[PDB]
Scaffold this motif. Structure first.
Motif, PDB file in Angstrom:
ATOM      1  N   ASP A   1      -6.922   0.632  -3.655  1.00  0.00           N
ATOM      2  CA  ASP A   1      -6.513   1.988  -3.297  1.00  0.00           C
ATOM      3  C   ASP A   1      -4.950   2.077  -3.169  1.00  0.00           C
TER       4      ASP A   1
ATOM      5  N   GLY B   1       7.272   7.064  -6.624  1.00  0.00           N
ATOM      6  CA  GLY B   1       7.313   8.503  -6.520  1.00  0.00           C
ATOM      7  C   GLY B   1       8.027   9.122  -5.310  1.00  0.00           C
TER       8      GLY B   1
ATOM      9  N   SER C   1       7.057  14.669   3.368  1.00  0.00           N
ATOM     10  CA  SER C   1       5.644  14.959   3.104  1.00  0.00           C
ATOM     11  C   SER C   1       5.296  14.430   1.708  1.00  0.00           C
ATOM     12  N   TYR C   2       4.062  13.995   1.528  1.00  0.00           N
ATOM     13  CA  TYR C   2       3.634  13.447   0.268  1.00  0.00           C
ATOM     14  C   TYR C   2       2.640  14.400  -0.387  1.00  0.00           C
TER      15      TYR C   2
ATOM     16  N   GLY D   1       2.727   4.779  -5.994  1.00  0.00           N
ATOM     17  CA  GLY D   1       2.210   5.180  -4.725  1.00  0.00           C
ATOM     18  C   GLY D   1       0.996   6.090  -4.823  1.00  0.00           C
ATOM     19  N   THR D   2       0.537   6.416  -6.001  1.00  0.00           N
ATOM     20  CA  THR D   2      -0.625   7.203  -6.253  1.00  0.00           C
ATOM     21  C   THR D   2      -1.751   6.320  -6.765  1.00  0.00           C
ATOM     22  N   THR D   3      -2.973   6.421  -6.244  1.00  0.00           N
ATOM     23  CA  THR D   3      -4.013   5.551  -6.706  1.00  0.00           C
ATOM     24  C   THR D   3      -4.520   5.826  -8.129  1.00  0.00           C
TER      25      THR D   3
ATOM     26  N   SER E   1      -9.619   5.678   1.721  1.00  0.00           N
ATOM     27  CA  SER E   1      -8.876   6.870   1.215  1.00  0.00           C
ATOM     28  C   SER E   1      -8.171   6.591  -0.104  1.00  0.00           C
ATOM     29  N   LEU E   2      -7.904   7.695  -0.791  1.00  0.00           N
ATOM     30  CA  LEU E   2      -6.989   7.660  -1.947  1.00  0.00           C
ATOM     31  C   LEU E   2      -5.560   8.015  -1.466  1.00  0.00           C
ATOM     32  N   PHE E   3      -4.579   7.576  -2.207  1.00  0.00           N
ATOM     33  CA  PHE E   3      -3.192   7.801  -1.886  1.00  0.00           C
ATOM     34  C   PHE E   3      -2.492   8.633  -2.926  1.00  0.00           C
ATOM     35  N   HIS E   4      -1.455   9.345  -2.542  1.00  0.00           N
ATOM     36  CA  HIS E   4      -0.820  10.353  -3.351  1.00  0.00           C
ATOM     37  C   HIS E   4       0.673  10.326  -3.109  1.00  0.00           C
TER      38      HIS E   4
ATOM     39  N   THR F   1       6.476  12.371  -3.520  1.00  0.00           N
ATOM     40  CA  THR F   1       6.848  13.450  -2.602  1.00  0.00           C
ATOM     41  C   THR F   1       7.103  14.694  -3.418  1.00  0.00           C
ATOM     42  N   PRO F   2       6.347  15.756  -3.128  1.00  0.00           N
ATOM     43  CA  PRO F   2       6.437  16.947  -3.929  1.00  0.00           C
ATOM     44  C   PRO F   2       7.717  17.696  -3.739  1.00  0.00           C
TER      45      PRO F   2
END
Lengths: 330, 7
Positions: free
Chosen positions: A15, A37, A78-79, A221-223, B1-4, B6-7
Motif C-alpha cells: 500500500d 508527488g 493536504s494530500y 506516494g500514491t498506491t 488503506s490506500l494512499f494518495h 499534494t493537490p
C-alpha cells in the motif's frame, strides 16, 4: 556524493513503502514515505498532539544538538485524499542511505489528521517533487533532493520499487545492474510542480497497443494507477465479473478472476504491468470481491502513475536544468 | 488503506 536506501512495503499489498531516514545528532531514525508527488519533509514529533500519535516514532528536536528552530516558519499541507498535517520547522542534519544534507528543513507536526494517526508504520513523509510546491511560510524551503543536488555525482534519483518485496531509492547515480534493456527518457513539465510526463499509449493484455497521449504524474506516494475512464473501462472489460461499484469507490472484480497485464508507453518503449500487480485483495476481510489496482482519474483532475505502475519499472528522476524521466523494464 | 500523497 551518493546515497542508497532500501524501501520496504508497509503491508502485504504494497500500500506504501517506508525508508529509514536519519535526522539530527545523535541520529534519530524515522521511517518516512518518499513521495514524488509533494515537496515537504515532515515528521511526527515531540510537538505532535499526544492523542494524534499512536505507535509512530517521533523526532525530538531538543535531543538533537544540530537542530535549530527556523524562527517564524510554519507549514500546512493536504494530500489527494484530504488527509493533512501542519506545524513548525527546524533545520537539522538529514541523511538518507549515506547521503547527508546539513541545514535541511525538517517540518515538525503539531497536528496530523486521523488517517495519519491510524498508520503506525509511517513516521512522516519525504517529498521529492519540485521545491515550488513546498508549503513552508513565509520562506519556502527546498527538498532534500534540491539541497543534495549540487553535492551529488549526477543530479538524479532513482526509484526501484518492489512487488511484494523491498526496493531501492538511489541518489546521485544510475545502477546499471538494476534494470534490463535500455532506459527511455521522456520530457517533464514542471509547470504544476510535479514530475509530469506524457505516456504514448496503452495495451490491455495481449491486445493491440492504442497510441494516445496520456498526461500524468509520477507519484511514489500514491498506491494505485489512476487513468482516464476510457482506458480504465477498456481494461476492466477484459475481466469477467468486474464492475465499477459506487459504494466501494471504484472497480472491483471477483477474487477468482485472473487479471490481464496492462502496458503503458514511454516514447517508443513499453512498460508491462503484470496482472498480479493489479490485484489489491479483498475489499474487506473475507470478501470475494477484490479491489482493482487501475482506477479512474475522472474525479481527480490529473492522471497518476502511482506505485502499481512505477513498481513495474526502474524509474530515473533526472533533476538536471531541464528535468526528464527515464523508464526501464526490470 | 490506500494512499494518495499534494493537490
Amino acid at each position: 556524493s551518493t546515497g542508497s536506501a532500501t524501501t520496504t512495503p508497509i503491508d502485504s499489498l504494497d500500500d506504501a513503502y517506508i525508508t529509514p531516514v536519519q535526522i539530527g545528532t545523535p541520529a534519530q531514525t524515522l521511517n518516512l514515505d518518499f513521495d514524488t508527488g509533494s515537496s515537504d519533509l515532515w515528521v511526527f514529533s515531540s510537538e505532535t498532539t499526544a492523542s494524534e500519535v499512536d505507535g509512530q516514532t517521533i523526532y525530538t528536536p531538543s535531543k538533537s544538538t544540530t537542530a535549530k528552530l527556523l524562527s517564524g516558519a510554519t507549514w500546512s499541507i493536504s494530500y489527494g485524499d484530504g488527509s493533512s498535517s501542519s506545524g513548525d520547522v527546524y533545520t537539522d542534519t538529514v541523511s538518507v542511505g549515506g547521503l547527508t544534507v546539513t541545514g535541511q528543513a525538517v517540518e515538525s507536526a503539531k497536528k496530523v489528521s486521523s488517517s495519519f494517526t491510524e498508520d503506525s508504520t509511517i513516521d512522516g513523509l519525504l517529498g521529492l517533487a519540485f521545491s515550488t510546491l513546498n508549503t513552508v511560510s513565509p520562506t519556502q524551503q527546498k527538498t532534500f533532493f534540491d539541497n543534495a543536488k549540487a553535492s551529488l555525482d549526477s543530479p538524479v534519483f532513482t526509484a526501484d520499487l518492489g512487488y511484494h518485496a523491498p526496493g531501492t531509492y538511489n541518489f546521485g547515480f544510475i545502477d546499471t545492474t538494476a534494470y534490463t534493456g535500455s532506459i527511455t527518457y521522456t520530457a517533464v513539465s514542471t509547470k504544476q510542480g510535479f514530475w509530469e510526463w506524457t505516456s504514448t499509449g496503452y495495451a490491455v493484455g495481449s491486445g493491440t497497443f492504442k497510441s494516445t497521449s496520456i498526461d500524468g504524474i509520477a507519484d511514489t506516494g500514491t498506491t494505485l494507477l489512476y487513468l482516464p475512464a476510457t482506458v480504465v473501462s477498456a481494461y476492466w472489460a477484459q475481466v469477467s465479473g468486474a464492475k465499477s461499484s459506487s459504494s466501494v469507490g471504484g472497480y472491483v472484480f471477483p477474487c477468482s478472476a485472473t487479471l490481464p497485464s496492462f502496458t503503458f508507453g514511454v516514447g517508443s518503449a513499453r512498460i508491462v504491468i503484470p496482472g498480479d500487480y493489479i490485484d489489491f485483495g479483498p475489499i474487506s476481510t473475507g470478501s470475494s470481491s477484490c479491489f482493482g489496482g487501475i482506477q479512474s482519474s475522472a474525479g481527480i483532475g490529473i492522471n497518476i502513475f502511482g506505485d502499481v505502475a512505477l513498481k513495474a519499472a526502474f524509474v530515473v528522476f533526472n533533476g538536471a536544468t531541464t528535468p526528464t524521466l527515464g523508464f526501464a523494464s526490470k | 488503506s490506500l494512499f494518495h500523497x499534494t493537490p
